[PDB]
Structure formats: C-alpha cells, structure tokens
Design a protein around this nucleic acid. Structure first.
Lengths: 110, 1041
RNA sequence: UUUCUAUUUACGUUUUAGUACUCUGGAAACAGAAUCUACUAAAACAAGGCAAAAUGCCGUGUUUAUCUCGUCAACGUUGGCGAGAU
C-alpha cells in the first residue's frame, strides 16, 4: 500500500495543481481527469509510449502540439506496443513544462 | 398536463439525477440525469491567487512610476540621464556617505522602492518549502544587522557569497526606512531637497494598504470605509435581514454549541434523561468554566452518577469523547481571572469579534483600547497575542440569544427549535418569486461542490415543475462523498478491506478443507467480531461448526427493523435459533432481564463493554444498540432511531430541505419534501437485486434516483410505517414483516426495463475562461531553418532526476552546450562515463568530490552549473509575445492556445470549420466581442469563400451530429489538421473501452475536413429532451457576459 | 458545515543591457566572435481594456440549451423582462 501525492506549481508559483493516487499510473489518470488533458504537455502519453517501444519520434513529426502525423501513430498503435511500466508515469509528469513547470512528488508508505 | 407524480432526486457531486413515478400505478413518466464538470475549490483559488498577484505587480509598477515622477519634479532624474550602468548596491553604500551623482542617487531611490520588504512580521502567508521560515529569516537578519544597514549586508553577501537574490534576501521594512532616511540625510546636503520631498519619499517607501482598506475607488471588490468593511466581511444574516452575522468563536455562540451537546446527552437516572435548567446551569458553570477541555468522566463525577449511563454524544475520529469547550472563556482566564471581565457576555463577544476580524495585533490592541471596558493596559498587550480565532460567518447574535433562551428553559435541540419558531429565510422574499430562487443557496455555508449541485438540482426542480406540474412529493438524497478526492480515498480503503476479508476467507478455506465459506462470508465476519461467543447466552461457538452446521446459527437483528431502520452489520449478530425465537421483536435489555436468557443482563453488559474495548471488534453504535435500555415504544425514541438511521442530519441536506420547505410554505403549496439516508438506498438497491454493475455509464445516477422516489410509495401503502413518514416528512413488527414490506419486487422491473434515460450536459459558454498556458518558453533557430523551443534542465544535482544522463547517452547534440560551448560538454561527459552506474551520476560526483559541475575554465574559477538548456521540439502553435520584450534576437512564444469555440461552414459541398480561439474574444466593459480582424484572418487561413453558408457554432459540450452519430464536443484538438474531440453522450469513452476490454487510446478524436457528410447541432434542456437546434445565419459576435 | 474576500513579502519563467566565462586574430591594447554557463540592474509575466499624477482600476470563479414572440434596457445586436415554440 502506498499513497503518492503530486504537487505541481505553475511557473509563477501562484496557481497550484494537486492530484493523488495509489500507483504513479493512478496519479496520471487523476491529473488528466480533474485538471483536464492539456495541463501537461500536448500528447505526452503517446510520445513516451513511442519512445519506450523504440520508434524514432522525428518520423511521426513530433511538434509542440506533439504527434502531428496521426495517420502513422494509428499504425504503431495497431502493432502490439510494449506498455509503460508504472515507473515512467513519473517521467510523463516530469517531462511536461507547458503549465506545471515545478513538479514535486511525495510518496507516503503506510 | 395535470398528473399526480412523486419526484426523486439523486444529488451527487458530478451529477443530479431526477426520476418521476406515478402516484397510483408505480409507473415511470420520465427519468434522466443532469451533468456538470466537477466544481473544485482550486479554480477559484486560482483566480484569487492570481488577482492577488496582478495587484502586487500593479502596485510595484505604480510605486516605481510615482517615484520616477517625483524625481523628475526635483530634476534629480531626467529623460536624457542614463541609469543603465549604475550598480544599485554599490551606490547605496557610497551614498550612506560621500556624495551620489544625480543618476546614482536616482538609481538607489528607485531601487529601494522596487523592494520595500515585509512590515508585519507574521503577516506573511506562504509555505515553508524554502526550509527557512519568514519569521526566523527576519530574526537572523536582524541579529546580523545590529550595527550594519541593509545595503552593507547585501553588498557583503554579493562580494563574499557571490549572490544577493534568493530566499536569504527577505528583510523588514523598518530597516529599509532607516537606510533610506540615513542616506537621504547625507545626500540632501549636496542637492536641492526639502523636508516635504523627504517625507513624500519615506511615505512612498513604507506606504501599504491595510487588510481593512481594500482596493481603491471603482473596484468591484472594494468598500468605501470600515463600517462597509464589517458589512462585507460579515454579511447580512439570512434569518434576520438587517442584523449582521457574528463570529463563531464568540462566547455566546460557544455557549449555544455547548448547550446543544448538553441537551443531546442522555443520562440513565431516576430523574429525566435530559438535563433540566438548574443542573444544566450547574454543569455548564463547573465543567466549562473550571476545566479547559471537558471530558465525560468529569461530567460523571460532578453529577455523581455512572459514566456508563451517558449516551448520545458526538465522538472524534479516534473514539475519544468530544465536547465543545468555551475556548475564548478559558483563554481569558489563562491571562486574567478578575470577575469584572469573565461575567460580561457583551465584553467577551466584542473581544472575540475583534480577535477574529483584526488579524494584526497592533490593530487588536488599539480596538480594545478604544472599547471603554475594565481592561487594563498591561492585560491588553497579553490578550492581543491570542490565536486560532478564525471563523467569520456564523448564526447572528440576536438569533443566538433567542435560541439560547429556549435551550436553557427546555431540553430540545436546534432542529426542532427551528421548526417550532418557524424561522424562515428573509434575504429574498419567497412570495413574489414565481420559481424556487437560486440566490438562497449562496448564503448557507456549503462547499462549492455542494453549492453547484444544489443550484443544478433547484433548476431541475424548476424545469420539472414547469413541465409536468406541481410535484405531490419530492425526495432528496445528497450523496455521502464530499468531493472526488474522497471518492477515491474511500474506494481505495474499501478495496483494501475487501482484500483483507478475502484473505481471511482464503486462510479459512485451507484450514477447513471445505467450500462452505463461499456462501458463509456474512456469518464468518460476525464470528470473529463476537470472538465465537453467542452475545445472548455467552456460550462459546467453534468456528468449524459454523461451516459444518450453518443452520445452528442465524443472523439476528439487535433492534427490530420496524423502528431501527438499520440493516448494517452493526445491527447483525450470530445467535442460537432458540435465542432468536425467544427474543422476538423486542430489545436485548428486557430479554436479558427476562428469564429466557441463560445469562444475566449485568454480566452481559460487563462482557459487552470489555469486548467493545478489546480488539476494536464492537463498534460504537453496536454497544449502544445492545444496551438500549430506553423503551422503543416511546414516540421520542422511535423518532430518534428514524433520525439517526433514515433522516439525513448533515448541514447541507438540512439547509436544502429547509429552503424548499420554506418556499413551498410561503406560496401555500401542499408539497411534502423528505430526505433519505445514504445507506438506505444502498440497502434497497441490494434487496431488489439491481446492483448488476456500476460501469453502465451515467444511467446509474438516474436509476438510483428512481429507487429513491419508489421509497415514498412504499411509505404510504402501509399504515404500519405511515406515522414514521409523518415524522420524516416533517406498530412494532418482526423482521419477516419488514422483509414482506420492502423486499417485494412487484412493479420494480420497470426500472430494469426503462431504456429512454435522457441525459444532458452543462454547456460552458463563459468567455475569458483561460487564454494561454503560462511558461514563457524561449526559442532558437537551428541549421535547417526551423525554430525549436528551448526547455531547460533543472535540479541536475538532485538524487532522483536522471534526465541529463538519458539525454547525454542518447542524443548529446540536443544540449545547447554541445555546439555553443564544447569544452564544458567534455567535462560533463567524462563525469557521466566514470560514475555512469548511479541513476544520477552528478549526485554521486557531489557525494565524493563535494563540488558541483563547474563550467570549464583555465583558472578553475568557473561558476556553478544548475540549469543546462536543451533544444526540445519544434514550434507549431504559439501566441507570439515577442513584441513585449524589446529588441529580442530570438523569438519568445507561448503554447497551447485554448480554443473558445468553433464555427462550421459548408463551402462547395465540403464541411470546414474555423476555430474562434479564446485569444480573439477581447473585453470591452460589460460586453465580450469576437475580434473581427483576427476572426477574418482565421477564416481566410482556412480557405473559406465569402459566400460560404453558415451551419452552426459549437461551444463546449454542445451536442454535434457527425454522419449520424451524436457526440459532445470537448474542444478542437488541432485546428490545422481539422481534428475535433468528442466524448460519447451516455458513457465516458474511458468506460466504454473497459466494458469491451479494448486498449484503444481514451479520447475519441474525429475529423471534419473531408468525407464528413453531415454536421448538425443538437441541444438538450436541463431536463434532457433532445431538440435539433436551428441556429442564426451570422456567427454570434457580442455575448452579454 | 469552511465558503467568499482582503493586504504583503521573497522568490520564479523570459528578453535586453552590463560584468565575469569560452575562443580567435594577437605581444595585445583591445578588436572581435560565440550568446553557452553564473551573477546584476531594468523591463514584460495570462491577449488586452479603462483611467488619468490617483495610499489608482478591471482580465483564468460562480451562474448558460436554441430558437422565438412581443416588453424594456443597453445600445443594430446584446440585455433584461415576460409569453410561447422547438
């Protein structure tokens, strides 16, 4: 049993976004539900999945908007992808700086 | 038309389900659920914290501007003069002596002004994440500033530590004022200055708006003077309109809460169970004026009875008995104990109001000084440092006195005092209003989630009343979860409990060697809680015999369900069939008193009390039910059981019930409104076997509501419980009668078969919602002519951050260092290769060498490296703010332009759409208008002809019909590629994927660019009817807002 | 039951300017180059809209089908009003 609480502050340290869940995967799933899907950088979940499988991000036209070649992404999804390992949802949160610039995760074991 | 019907509500946190039942035939006229995005306190904390910033930035800029204008007046600063090269710190130290040139002087004054520092040391409102508190920081700085002024300390820090900024430069305004006047006294001897200028500059330096002055003239969030300040901070009391609400920690309101608890207590004695006026006065005086924190044992000692006979009191989460204490009165007695102060209710009240509203101690002492009381000067200084008085809105004092008088004289409780006095909200006249007014929901202090749910529910009631006529009965359920953060915590805890019980079942299975445990979970849970002891006869029960002979033991109810209305495991026990048969529809008290039981009542009580404390196996309510000596035949006792088990008691449900009852009473409408406890609907769901699944979508919030309405119809077809209805809407039977009354699943299959569950979502036309995500990413230009965003690596030295490592090995050319400064890349690489094994090689380097990775230098005098910048990705969408930053060699951009709406056009037979971004809705006064120039540019960017026919304009959650499949727009994903985002109307897609176990990505994204045969607009009313909307022929330009 | 406000400090993301850094010409004065890494000042910090030397003021929250009738208001479109329809 573990509770992980994500405290994320916007760059000015003024507006604060906070979500919490059992496994880091839960933290991402709550943050994209409560505070919306674009608070983190656009298309980060897909970019990490593509990178973990090993595909070259440039071919899919990675942009600030993120995957811009939707046609190809759909083909990669068709192939049995190798899923994220619940230790990389942390990376998904700490590689986004669009709004949540300062990210600090506190992990409580009890 | 005119059709008698019962209305049921399920008021969740993210939905409000409504159901209609025929009064006669148990039919279902219409069902549905209104939806809305979950309200969160955070958003409003957002607007408020930011407003708080804009204001700080505006005040800093205005002070700088005013100082600059003042220095133009004395000719010390002129437009021709160049302040670019002057160093502020070096000039302040020089000017503390010698002379300053006109420029250096200007720089220094403007400099102090930019940064005045804090005034009230504790006034700061911030977290201790910096690891050094504000007060401790000022204390250390003052301890360091005994003989040195501010400038001296800052310059010494810059020359020795190399830095000035950071968390070490938090000072106090007094030292800044001292430095300013010291430098000015010297510099006025050489330049043309006057004492008026000196006073003006010192004023500008230390001036600040107090918390009780607010913004200036013309602000919507301001007030003219301090009386209006009281009005705004306190507000007019809803019960008596002209009187203002009082503070909560005030003594009179403390007496009211304490008397509530005292009246609620039940003591088994030869006198009345409820305490009467004289002994109530005795207990309140002694206990709540001689001891700081009252306990139950002290009460038992002072009334000289057994603490075992006291029941019916609030308890903390840890099981410790809780009694509200006269905190302000004991705080008074701590410092001064004279008679003249402690027996004056008005003086104590005024003291409390001052402590609660006036945050600054200097204001508090002054306000008590102005109060012509018996307080002495020495005592005021000590009393001014009291803390923890932080409640602003509480029942008005004039009404508090009236309630206290009735409480002293009679043993009643607040709810029935309110019913007897018939106190009605008077802020808004209920008589003139045609429909229930949503204004009243603002006044009751309810969390924003509950407030939004109440407003939506009231609108649903208004719509249903307007459509199907006046509702004969309304049943309102507020859901148990306060907010989502609790729905997950609870679901997680329940999962953990379910796992532990499953583990107990598995351990038993292996030892027993039988599968009987699969259907014996309810009894086996009871066995260990009773520790294998029949609570009615004390005989030991082996665990094996429970599985071998399940019929030798039965799950009996401690209290008959005709009155208890409780079906939880707390009201269940494992007993001998003969014990249950002999017990009947009665209470354990009179049965253990009777000779049928083979154990005495006192021994039973002794065993129950010791068992309850041991292993935490008996809950607080379980022993109360077992030891309920009061006769259930009494009307007051049955009413108490109904209220604790069937009628909701939380403040929120009550307030809504009181509001609706007052509205229906004022208009003389024969409408009965009633509430149902959260567990009752769960039980009635379980016994009608409707709980097949919880993932069928939102139709769940509707179905429960239907069941709620059905409860009314089963509370009037049977006279046995009819009186109870009169209790809950304002004989004794056995358990098989209860099963006959409630289990009967006739005409309940209608809920199973009804399929036309209308749904609706809340459209969000609000403009100015948000514009651009805030992180002013810089950009560079690469060799290929593109532009790349330059994200910056931060916290390199931290133990867990391995980004530098991953980037170095995978793609070195991305760090800006690789090309612009090569040598330093070589140093970083040599470090990464040697200590590569560690997750973070830099941290391991620090742990052995004690040096941060310095920039390469021939003299090894290089600065530290804490942020390394790297090229990241390319730029596609950007609000270019480069114009604001002057002469910028590289562009400065912001990302993620949040879309406001999108308008669909049919040109030459093909459907396109133009995205009206939120940045294009400029605000002029009250009206919000779409920037014509930017809208035209966006329209031309999509290659739209000037004769293109206009079809519709979609905001958030407006229903769209693309090629015949209905969807709800969440917002356009990418405008350039013509992709919009839709989540299904009935079940959120994420759920639609789980009921098929598919692993496709969670957001349906659909494309309108081509092969889109139809794009129609559908809209749904608060109830949920679906009406195709024929829109206007010109896209909306002015929204009133 | 705990919301709604209020004042303030330090930070912080960014550009420019300066001083250090790196480099080349080179004896270099310095000239540059590079704008990378640290400080330091000043400026911007949701797009912007008022206001007019003011202890100045608004901009991320609540409230929201659409169409309509008329009524009234802001100003023709929005309101608001009411009364319908879809």
């Amino acid at each position: 049993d573990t509770w992980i609480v994500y405290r994320g502050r916007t760059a000015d340290m003024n507006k604060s976004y906070i979500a919490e869940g059992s496994t880091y995967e839960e933290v991402y799933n709550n943050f994209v539900d409560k505070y919306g899907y674009d608070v983190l950088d656009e298309d980060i979940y897909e970019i990490q999945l593509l990178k973990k499988n090993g595909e070259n991000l440039d071919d899919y036209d990675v942009d600030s908007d993120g995957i811009n070649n939707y046609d190809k992404l759909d083909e990669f999804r068709e192939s049995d992808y190798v899923d994220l390992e619940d230790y990389d949802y942390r990376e998904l949160f700490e590689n986004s700086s669009s709004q949540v610039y300062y990210h600090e995760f506190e992990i409580t074991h009890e | 038309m005119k059709r008698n019907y019962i209305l049921g509500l399920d008021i969740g946190i993210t939905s409000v389900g409504y159901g209609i039942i025929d009064y006669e035939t148990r039919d279902v006229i219409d069902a549905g659920v209104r939806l809305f995005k979950e309200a969160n306190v955070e958003n409003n904390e957002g607007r408020r914290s930011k407003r708080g910033a804009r204001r700080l930035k505006r005040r800093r800029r205005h002070r700088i501007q005013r100082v600059k204008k003042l220095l133009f007046d004395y000719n010390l600063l002129t437009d021709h003069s160049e302040l670019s090269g002057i160093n502020p710190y070096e000039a302040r130290v020089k000017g503390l002596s010698q002379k300053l040139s006109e420029e250096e002087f200007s720089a220094a004054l403007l400099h102090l002004a930019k940064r005045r520092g804090v005034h009230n040391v504790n006034e700061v409102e911030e977290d201790t994440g910096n690891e050094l508190s504000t007060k401790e920081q000022i204390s250390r700085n003052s301890k360091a500033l005994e003989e040195k002024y501010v400038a001296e300390l800052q310059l010494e820090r810059l020359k020795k530590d190399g830095e000035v900024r950071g968390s070490i430069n938090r000072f106090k305004t007094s030292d800044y004022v001292k430095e300013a006047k010291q430098l000015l006294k010297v510099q006025k001897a050489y330049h043309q200055l006057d004492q008026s200028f000196i006073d003006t500059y010192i004023d500008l330096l230390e001036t600040r708006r107090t918390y009780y002055e607010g913004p200036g003239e013309g602000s919507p969030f301001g007030w003219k003077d301090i009386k209006e300040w009281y009005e705004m901070l306190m507000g007019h009391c809803t019960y008596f309109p002209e009187e203002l609400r009082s503070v909560k920690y005030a003594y009179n309101a403390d007496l009211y809460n304490a008397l509530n608890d005292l009246n609620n207590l039940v003591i088994t004695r030869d006198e009345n169970e409820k305490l009467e006026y004289y002994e109530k006065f005795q207990i309140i005086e002694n206990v709540f004026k001689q001891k700081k924190k009252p306990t139950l044992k002290q009460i038992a000692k002072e009334i000289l009875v057994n603490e075992e006979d006291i029941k019916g009191y609030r308890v903390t989460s840890t099981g410790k008995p809780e009694f509200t204490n006269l905190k302000v009165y004991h705080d008074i007695k701590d410092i001064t104990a004279r008679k003249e102060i402690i027996e004056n209710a008005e003086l104590l009240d005024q003291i409390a109001k001052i402590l609660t509203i006036y945050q600054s101690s200097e204001d508090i002492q002054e306000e008590l000084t102005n109060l012509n009381s018996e307080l002495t000067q020495e005592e005021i200084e000590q009393i001014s440092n009291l803390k923890g008085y932080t409640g602003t809105h509480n029942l008005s004092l004039k009404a508090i006195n009236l309630i206290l008088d009735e409480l002293w004289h009679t043993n009643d409780n607040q709810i029935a005092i309110f019913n007897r006095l018939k106190l009605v909200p008077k802020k808004v006249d209920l008589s003139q209003q045609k429909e229930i007014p949503t204004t009243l929901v603002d006044d009751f202090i309810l969390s924003p989630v509950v407030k939004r749910s109440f407003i939506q529910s009231i609108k649903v009631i208004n719509a249903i009343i307007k459509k199907y006529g006046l509702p004969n009965d309304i049943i309102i359920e507020l859901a148990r979860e306060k907010n989502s953060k609790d729905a997950q915590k609870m679901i997680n805890e329940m999962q953990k409990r379910n796992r532990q019980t499953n583990e107990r079942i598995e351990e038993i299975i292996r030892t027993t060697g039988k599968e009987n445990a699969k259907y014996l979970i309810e009894k086996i849970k009871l066995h260990d809680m009773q520790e294998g002891k029949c609570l009615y006869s004390l005989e030991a029960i082996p665990l094996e015999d429970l599985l071998n002979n399940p019929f030798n033991y039965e799950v009996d109810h401690i209290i008959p369900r005709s009155v208890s209305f409780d079906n939880s495991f707390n009201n269940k026990v494992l007993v001998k069939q003969e014990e249950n048969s002999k017990k009947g529809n009665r209470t354990p008290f009179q049965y253990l008193s009777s000779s049928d039981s083979k154990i005495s009542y006192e021994t039973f009580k002794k065993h129950i009390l010791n068992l309850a404390k041991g292993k935490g196996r008996i809950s607080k309510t379980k022993k109360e039910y077992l030891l309920e000596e009061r006769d259930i035949n009494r009307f007051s006792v049955q009413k108490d059981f109904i209220n604790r088990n069937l009628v909701d008691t939380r403040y929120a449900t009550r307030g809504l019930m009181n509001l609706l009852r007052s509205y229906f009473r004022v208009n003389n409408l024969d409408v009965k409104v009633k509430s149902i406890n959260g567990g009752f609907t769960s039980f009635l769901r379980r016994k009608w076997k409707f709980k097949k699944e919880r993932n069928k979508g939102y139709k769940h919030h509707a179905e429960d509501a239907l069941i709620i309405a059905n409860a009314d119809f089963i509370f009037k077809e049977w006279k046995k419980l009819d009186k109870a209805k009169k209790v809950m809407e304002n004989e004794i039977e056995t358990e098989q009668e209860y099963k006959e009354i409630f289990i009967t699943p006739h005409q309940i299959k209608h809920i199973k078969d009804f399929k036309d569950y209308k749904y609706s979502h809340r459209v969000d036309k609000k403009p100015n919602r948000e514009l651009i995500n805030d992180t002013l990413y810089s950009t560079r230009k690469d060799d290929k002519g593109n532009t790349l965003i330059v994200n910056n690596l931060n916290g390199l030295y931290d133990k867990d951050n391995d980004k530098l490592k991953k980037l170095i090995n995978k793609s070195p050319e991305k760090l800006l260092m690789y090309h612009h400064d090569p040598q330093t890349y070589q140093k970083l690489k040599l470090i990464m290769e040697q200590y590569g094994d560690e997750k973070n090689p830099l941290y391991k380097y620090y742990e052995e060498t004690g040096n941060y990775l310095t920039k390469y230098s021939k003299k090894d005098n290089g600065p530290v490296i804490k942020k390394i910048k790297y090229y990241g990705n390319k730029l596609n969408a950007h609000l270019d703010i480069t114009d604001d930053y002057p002469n910028s060699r590289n562009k400065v951009v912001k990302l993620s332009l949040k879309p406001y709406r999108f308008d669909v056009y049919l040109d030459n037979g093909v459907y396109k759409f133009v995205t009206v971004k939120n940045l294009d809705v400029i605000k002029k006064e009250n009206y919000y208008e779409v920037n014509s120039k930017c809208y035209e540019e966006a329209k031309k960017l999509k290659k739209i002809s000037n004769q293109a026919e206009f079809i519709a304009s979609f905001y958030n959650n407006d229903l769209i019909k693309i090629n015949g499949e209905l969807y709800r727009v969440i917002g356009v994903n990418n405008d350039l590629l013509n992709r919009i985002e839709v989540n299904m109307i009935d079940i959120t897609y994420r759920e639609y994927l789980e009921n098929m176990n598919d692993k496709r990505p969670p957001r349906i994204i659909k494309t309108i660019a081509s092969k889109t045969q139809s794009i129609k607009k559908y809209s749904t009313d608060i109830l949920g009817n679906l009406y195709e909307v024929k829109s206007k022929k010109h896209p909306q330009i002015i929204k009133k807002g």
